[PDB]
């Protein structure tokens, strides 16, 4: 038996730390895909989270910033966010956690010595190291066929190694059909000006072709705060007539990441997206009217979090996951995870890294696991208090569900 919270805490932390992670959403790529996989300290420092933060302090114009080299941008951000002010933000703290995890010494602030660590290694070797340090067993990528570069890799016959899984990302198709439909035809998809049977069949054929090629764990899309469904728009029709029917046939979940208001500040590039609270109506309708379809949902607005949890209590075909983007901060991760566990027990996926740079797997999982561990400790302590006898083996089981099994069980893999 575990007769003290102090021992419980030790056992929970060990279980959480030792549990291999299935990161169901990132922007990483299998090493064999090439340069598309970003990594190293200069990439860490130029993460768009830090671009947005440095612009709040630096007097260097954004145009000038984009004009300088990768190394130069990294030097500015380091100096502005780490030296001129203490690197206390979550994103800056993350950079330090990565350095320490790699065996480097943040206390020296010797950026050139840090850069030297990476220069003497290959992509293949760094992924081996990072996956080991972050104890991540499986990585789900974001695979967009509309991106020429990435698309070439799939066209070439490249296959991700066993540690990487594909996810068919469809923002262009579902959100910019009017402009995208012209590319589909360039590829042999006979989509017509009007939405008839021929257009529907060709879109599905498109979806089906890529599903066969990537063997994705799910199809995904990021939607605006004004997302609605049903809706008489290209998106509404594509989802109704093509995506859902196909998703059902192949029994693959549809991942919806709702809440993002793209480019409210275009000059900032990837760092220029905002957020807004969304209506739950469309998700409510999708879940109810399509019981044979599986939905993975994460929302961007803090104000959408609690009702999303309640919606999960209503529908079993809904699997909520992670603390996305602006939600990926300790104060928010903590409240989200507690609301979720209190109303759903362990039937949810608490987190994903959303890593854009390989090394971030270290900090994203380190910072998140410690928070998740604290929550589990409280919840286990409360039932131990109620006389329940939790075993270390049950704790390991629960932890496996949260960090890995719940995802594979839901996707059916």
Contact letters (x/-) for a second copy, 246-275, by CB under 8 A? ------------------xx--x--xx-xx
157: left (phi over 0), alpha (psi -120 to 50) or beta: left
CB of 170 to ligand REL, least distance (A): 11
137 contacts 110 by C-beta, under 8 angstroms: no
Distance CA 375, CA 13 (A): 11
Q: Which of residues 97-156 bind a second copy (CB under 8 A)?
A: 97, 99-100, 105-107, 109
User: 265 labelled as ligand-binding?
Assistant: no
| Using rule CB under 8 A, residue 310 touches a second copy | yes
Contact string (CB under 6 A) for ligand REL, positions 218-237, x = contact: ----x---------------
User: Burial code of 273-285, b = ≥16 C-beta within 10 A, e = fewer?
Assistant: bebbbbebebbbe
Q: Are 31 and 124 in contact (CB under 8 A)?
A: yes
CA 323-51-84 angle, to 5 degrees, is 110
303 contact choice in Zn ion, Cl ion, ligand REL, none (CB below 5 to 8 Å, kind-dependent): Cl ion
- The answer on whether 27 is annotated among ligand-binding residues is yes
Q: Which residue has the tokens 């993975």?
A: 296
What is the smallest separation between the CB atom of 236 and a second copy, expressed in angstroms?
A: 20
Helix ranges (H only) for 165-304 are 171-175, 177-186, 197-214, 234-238, 244-249, 281-289
Taking CB under 8 A as the criterion, which residues in 365-394 touch a second copy? Answer: 376, 379-390, 394
Residues 14, 17, 32, 89: which binds a second copy (CB under 8 A)?
Answer: 89
- Residues 350, 404 contacting (CB under 8 angstroms): no
Considering only residues 84 through 123, tell me which ones interact with ligand REL, judged by CB under 6 A: none
For residue 299, give the nearest of 321, 267, 268 by alpha carbon: 321
Using CB under 6 A, which of 227, 229, 325, 365 touches ligand REL?
A: 325
35 labeled part of a ligand binding site: no
Position among 302, 356, 366, 369 found at the interface with ligand REL (CB under 6 A):
356
**Residue 315 binding: pick among ligand REL, a second copy, Zn ion, none (C-beta 5-8 Å cut-off by kind):** a second copy
Nearest to 345 by CA among 402, 288, 283, 294: 402
Q: Which of 41, 98, 223, 257 binds ligand REL (CB under 6 A)?
A: 257
Interacting partner of 124 out of a second copy, ligand REL, Zn ion, none (Cβ under 5 to 8 A depending on kind): none
Q: Which stretch binds a second copy (CB under 8 A): 35-43, 111-119, 191-199, 342-350?
A: 342-350
Total number of residues binding a second copy (CB under 8 A)? 85
User: What are the backbone dihedrals phi and psi of residue 319, each rounded to the nearest 5 degrees, phi first?
Assistant: -120, 115
Please work out the total of residues on this chain that contact ligand REL, with binding judged by CB under 6 A.
Answer: 8
CB of 302 to Cl ion, least distance (A): 9
Q: Binding string to a second copy for residues 7 to 36, with x set by CB under 8 A, is what? A: x-----------------------------
Q: Which of 142, 293, 305, 337 touches ligand REL by CB under 6 A?
A: 142
Cα–Cα distances (Å) from 171 to 219, 250, 288, in that order, read 10, 20, 24
Return the one option of Cl ion, ligand REL, Zn ion, none that residue 164 interacts with (CB less than 5 to 8 A, by type). Answer: none
Beta strand 219-223 pairing with 295-299 = unpaired
Max CA pair span of the chain? 69
CA 381, CA 388: separation in Å to the nearest integer? 9
**Quick one: what does residue 55 bind among Zn ion, a second copy, ligand REL, none, with the CB cut-off 5 to 8 Å set by partner type?**
a second copy
Classify residue 13 by burial, with Cβ atoms within 10 Å: 0-12, 13-18, 19+. middle
**Dihedral angle sign, alpha carbons of residues 208, 216, 49, 68:** negative
331 carries a ligand binding annotation: yes
Residue nearest to ligand REL (CB): 222
Minimal distance, residue 140 CB to a second copy, in Å: 22
Give yes or no for residue 55 binding a second copy (CB under 8 A): yes
Tell me the Ramachandran region of residue 215: left when phi exceeds 0, alpha when psi lies from -120 to 50, beta otherwise: left
CA distance 112 to 161: 32
Binding site, annotated residues for Mg(2+): 331
Binding site, annotated residues for Zn(2+): 25, 27, 331, 354
The residues that touch ligand REL, with contacts defined as CB under 6 A, are 27, 142, 222, 257, 270, 325, 354, 356
Binding site, annotated residues: 25, 27, 331, 354
């Amino acid at each position: 038996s575990i007769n003290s919270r102090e021992v419980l805490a030790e056992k929970v932390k060990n279980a959480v730390n030792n549990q291999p992670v299935t990161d169901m959403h990132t922007h990483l790529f299998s090493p064999n895909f090439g340069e598309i996989l970003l990594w190293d300290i200069d990439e860490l420092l130029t993460y768009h989270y830090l671009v947005a933060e440095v612009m709040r302090w630096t007097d260097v114009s954004i145009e000038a910033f984009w004009a300088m080299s990768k190394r130069e941008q990294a030097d500015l951000i380091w100096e502005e966010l780490f030296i001129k002010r203490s690197p206390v933000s979550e994103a800056c703290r993350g950079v330090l956690t990565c350095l320490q995890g790699l065996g480097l010494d943040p206390a020296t602030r010797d950026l050139q010595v840090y850069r030297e660590y990476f220069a003497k290694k290959t992509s293949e070797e760094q992924v081996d190291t990072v996956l080991q340090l972050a104890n991540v067993s499986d990585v789900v990528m974001t695979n967009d066929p509309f991106d020429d570069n990435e698309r070439i890799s799939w066209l070439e016959g490249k296959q991700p190694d066993s540690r990487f899984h594909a996810a068919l990302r469809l923002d262009p198709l579902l959100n910019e059909y009017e402009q995208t439909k012209h590319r589909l035809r360039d590829w042999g998809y006979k989509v017509n000006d009007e939405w008839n049977e021929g257009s529907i069949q060709e879109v599905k054929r498109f979806l089906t072709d890529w599903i066969e090629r990537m063997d994705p764990v799910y199809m995904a899309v990021s939607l605006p705060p004004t997302f609605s469904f049903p809706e008489e728009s290209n998106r509404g029709r594509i989802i109704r007539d093509c995506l859902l029917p196909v998703a059902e046939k192949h029994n693959i979940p549809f991942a919806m990441m709702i809440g993002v208001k793209k480019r409210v500040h275009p000059a900032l590039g990837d760092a220029g997206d905002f957020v807004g609270k969304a209506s739950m109506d469309g998700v409510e309708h999708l879940l109810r009217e399509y019981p044979n379809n599986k939905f993975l949902v994460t929302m961007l607005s803090r104000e959408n979090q609690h009702e999303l949890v309640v919606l999960a209590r209503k529908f079993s075909n809904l699997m909520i996951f992670g603390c996305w983007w602006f939600m990926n901060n300790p104060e928010i991760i903590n409240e989200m995870t507690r609301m979720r566990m209190e109303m759903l027990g362990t039937s949810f996926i608490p987190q994903h890294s959303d890593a854009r740079v390989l090394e971030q797997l270290i900090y994203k999982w380190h910072h998140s696991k410690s928070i998740i561990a604290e929550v589990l400790i409280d919840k286990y302590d409360d039932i131990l208090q109620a006389g329940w006898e939790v075993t270390e083996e049950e704790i390991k089981r629960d932890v496996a569900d949260l960090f890995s099994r719940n995802f594979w069980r839901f996707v059916g893999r």
